[PDB]
Design a protein around this nucleic acid. Structure first.
Lengths: 79, 151, 114, 100, 127, 99
RNA sequence: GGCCGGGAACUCAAAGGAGACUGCCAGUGAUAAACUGGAGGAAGGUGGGGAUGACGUCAAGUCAUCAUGGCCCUUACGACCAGGGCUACACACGUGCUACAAUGGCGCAUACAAAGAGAAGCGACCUCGCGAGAGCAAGCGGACCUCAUAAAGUGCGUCGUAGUCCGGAUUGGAGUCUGCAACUCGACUCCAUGAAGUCGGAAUCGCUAGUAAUCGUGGAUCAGAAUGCCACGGUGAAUACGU
């Protein structure tokens, strides 16, 4: 969070992202890492984030950059 | 209390003048343990008052009190299931204490700009026999007179 | 005196009076009056047209009033459309910075409803 | 406390002792100003591959005789209950009941 | 020659040295008006001399530390009384009747478990 | 030169015994010593709950006291320094020697 | 400038001692036990504050600190792991903090404390940053160095009874630090926004003196996270006829 450190990301997620982008097409990518920032090279993909029970699919766009993955998968049910 | 005798605490006299009455007045006026503020207020008020009447501060103060000291009051009794107002005589220390309390209570309720100004206005009205303090004294005496049958 | 589209009082000191603008606080007020070169305790009723124009020039260096309001509204609308946690909080009317909701929260909820 | 919680604690302290110097090195690299700006990225990405249990902040102070995770005192290594028991028996030098 | 007195109050200690002639007071390398800017404090420090007519016959050199304003003032008064008694030894009766020879043994009471202060209890509810 | 001895304990009678012993053993070996100086005592305090469950008043309060003494030797000699370094004291006193 | 040569007198530090017992005087009383006044004395009648909890009562609390009779499960009611929850929100109650202002808010500059903690710890002087902080670096296992600048107070200006130059919830944007890692769900800083509230119905609580009220300071747990809990000093009241 301090700028002299840069952002944070998980290594396994980063490697999978690189493979998918360089190889082109991809089915949804499953992830438990809700603490990772979204980098510009992710746009266009489908990341399925854990929320406790299921995996919620998110189709990344360009306005999401700089968010954490967890903000697009809420954790509680209320009606 | 039930089985006690309580002695009298000693009180220092005022520094500027030398009266214990004025020290008790400062004490009754103070709040939260700030004696300096109370002394400032009282001294300023007495200064602005001495002019308006051309006499010493002590004389102005005494004449102001003599119109608010009460004489008889009413206590409440209930032994037969009904409340009765019984008139009683007031004693000197209580006379002075009640007068001071009423003067300060009336002062705090006015609507002038400064507390010293309110205090001075109230003291002047008292010396002229007008204001809430004198009204309170009159009301107490009226209640006491209306219940003389239960003495 | 008209400054940014509004009328600012005349009997107040300048540093207080300039605060009537939506976008200006005490820090910016002090900074602007320092740049203009006027004392902080001068009534606005004792100023000249040239001095008022200098103050207009100073105030013109910030974002105030309608532009600021549009900026804030767009900022909120972006989240509301995106649909993230904060956006859902915004479009339900509950606290957004993680405060308790078992009790209190009456500034975001309004008075009680039996 | 259960017999598996104490085992968890022993494992934690062991690993923290084992990996002490490597972490200090990596963290000095990441903290130091005027670095290559890719060595920083590398050190950050490597500090998270080590076992989680090797960080000193995953450890919990416990009573040395029972295992209680609450009411701990550092001067004695014990919880309030056992401190009182030993104190009344006379096993803590210099300690006694106080008034003032 | 010098005459000495020690005085104490709430948390304060005062050393008083007194000599003859030309009434002048010095406290912690300063004057009375410079040190104590309260009429009450000044009157307290001055009381014993006004009582025994020696206001303009003695030089006073004083030091004090600990406490606040009122504690220091009281410690000074006690010290002056003791030094004067050392000097003369026949003012004891008058000073005693005035009441300045006694040490005031009032201290701050301690905080206690289950209370909010020395004597103040939390709020009680029957239901 | 000058030698300094610092002594710590939990019991003042024990500490006084040790101090007297050191002073005498220095005086018998021909040296000058500046008597022991008493120094501020340390009071450490603890406060615990005395029930295995809820009750939140009902506490106990404990203390540990630490006593401390200092002794100075001004003019030493070889025999005396050996005499000090070859002395034994009780099983509850802490001794520090500085040269 | 206790700076320096010195002094052992005074503050103070901490070990051994003295002192308060109705001991002395006068009056009342059963030729008593006691009571009410007075002298000397720092203190007078239990001087002030702690610790100290009788035989028993409530089948009162705790098998989740621990120990233990009886029952119950053993490829599972026993292990290991990554994510989530204990932080939810139409509503009802207890305990607190900050206010609703001139005995006050804001700007300048100036007296006076007590008790504590410190080696994977406490971090000076100097430089950079508007600031939270950053870089380099002495000293200290401490009556020596560091944390660490008390605040209310006093002096001089301004505000002029207004939902305010009173109050500081909420929300936008930009940052710092601890930590593998601050979305859910951390503390602090900067610019901006500036809600309710003008003293609170029926009820109801604490306090007899260095007490109530009011102002600041420290510690335990603890990588980080107090308006809670345990301690310390400053200023300093009103009232008790009576049962």
């Amino acid at each position: 969070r301090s700028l002299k450190k840069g952002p944070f990301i998980d290594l396994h997620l980063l490697k999978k992202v690189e493979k998918a982008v360089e190889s082109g097409d991809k089915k949804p990518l499953r992830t438990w890492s809700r603490r990772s920032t979204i980098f510009p090279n992710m746009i266009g993909l489908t990341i399925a984030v854990h929320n406790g029970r299921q995996h919620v699919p998110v189709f990344v766009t360009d306005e999401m950059v700089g968010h954490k993955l967890g903000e697009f998968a809420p954790t509680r049910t209320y009606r | 209390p039930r089985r006690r005798v309580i002695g009298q605490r000693k009180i220092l006299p005022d520094p500027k003048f030398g009266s214990e009455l004025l020290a008790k007045f400062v004490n009754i006026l103070m709040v939260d343990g700030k004696k300096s503020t109370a002394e400032s207020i009282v001294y300023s008020a007495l200064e602005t008052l001495a002019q308006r009447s051309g006499k010493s501060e002590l004389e102005a103060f005494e004449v102001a009190l003599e119109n608010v000291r009460p004489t008889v009051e009413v206590k409440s009794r209930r032994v037969g299931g009904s409340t009765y107002q019984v008139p009683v005589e007031v004693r000197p220390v209580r006379r002075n204490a009640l007068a001071m309390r009423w003067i300060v209570e009336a002062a705090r309720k006015r609507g002038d700009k400064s507390m010293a100004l309110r205090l001075a206005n109230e003291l002047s009205d008292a010396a002229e026999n007008k204001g809430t303090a004198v009204k309170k004294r009159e009301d107490v005496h009226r209640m006491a007179e209306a219940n003389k049958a239960f003495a | 005196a008209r400054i940014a589209g509004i009328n600012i009082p005349d009997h107040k000191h300048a540093v207080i009076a300039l605060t009537s603008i939506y976008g200006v606080g005490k820090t910016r007020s002090k900074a602007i009056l320092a740049a203009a070169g006027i004392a902080e305790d001068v009534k606005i009723s004792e100023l000249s047209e040239g001095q008022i124009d200098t103050l207009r020039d100073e105030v013109a260096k910030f974002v105030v009033e309608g532009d600021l309001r549009r900026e804030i509204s767009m900022s909120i609308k972006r989240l509301m459309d995106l649909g993230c946690y904060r956006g859902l909080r915004h479009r339900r009317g509950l606290p957004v910075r993680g405060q308790r909701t078992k009790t209190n929260a009456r500034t975001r909820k309004g008075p009680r409803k039996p | 406390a259960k017999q598996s919680m104490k085992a968890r604690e022993v494992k934690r302290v062991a690993l923290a002792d084992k990996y002490f110097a490597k972490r200090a090195e990596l963290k000095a690299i990441i903290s130091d100003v005027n670095a290559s700006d890719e060595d920083r990225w590398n050190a950050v990405l490597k500090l998270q591959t080590l076992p989680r249990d090797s960080s000193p902040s995953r450890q919990r102070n416990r009573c040395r005789q029972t295992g209680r995770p609450h009411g701990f005192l550092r001067k004695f290594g014990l919880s309030r209950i056992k401190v009182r028991e030993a104190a009344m028996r006379g096993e803590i030098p210099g300690l006694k009941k106080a008034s003032w | 020659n010098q005459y000495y007195g020690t005085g104490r109050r709430k948390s304060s200690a005062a050393r008083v040295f007194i000599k003859p002639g030309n009434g002048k007071i010095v406290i912690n390398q300063r004057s009375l008006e410079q040190y104590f800017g309260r009429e009450t404090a000044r009157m307290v420090v001055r009381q014993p001399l006004e009582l025994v007519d020696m206001v303009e016959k003695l030089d006073l050199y004083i030091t004090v530390k600990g406490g606040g304003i009122s504690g220091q003032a009281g410690a000074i008064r006690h010290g002056i009384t003791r030094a004067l008694m050392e000097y003369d030894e026949s003012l004891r009766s008058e000073l005693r009747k005035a009441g300045f020879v006694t040490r005031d043994a009032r201290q701050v009471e301690r905080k206690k478990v289950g209370l909010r202060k020395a004597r103040r209890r939390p709020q009680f509810s029957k239901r | 030169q000058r030698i300094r001895i610092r002594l710590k304990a939990f019991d003042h009678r024990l500490i006084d015994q040790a101090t007297a012993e050191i002073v005498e053993t220095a005086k018998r070996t021909g040296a000058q010593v500046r008597g022991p100086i008493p120094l501020p005592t340390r009071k450490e305090r603890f406060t615990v709950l005395i029930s295995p469950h809820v009750n939140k008043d009902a506490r106990d309060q404990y203390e540990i006291r630490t006593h401390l003494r200092l002794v100075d030797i001004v003019e030493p000699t070889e025999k005396t320094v050996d005499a000090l370094m070859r002395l034994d004291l009780a099983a509850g006193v802490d001794v520090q020697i500085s040269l």
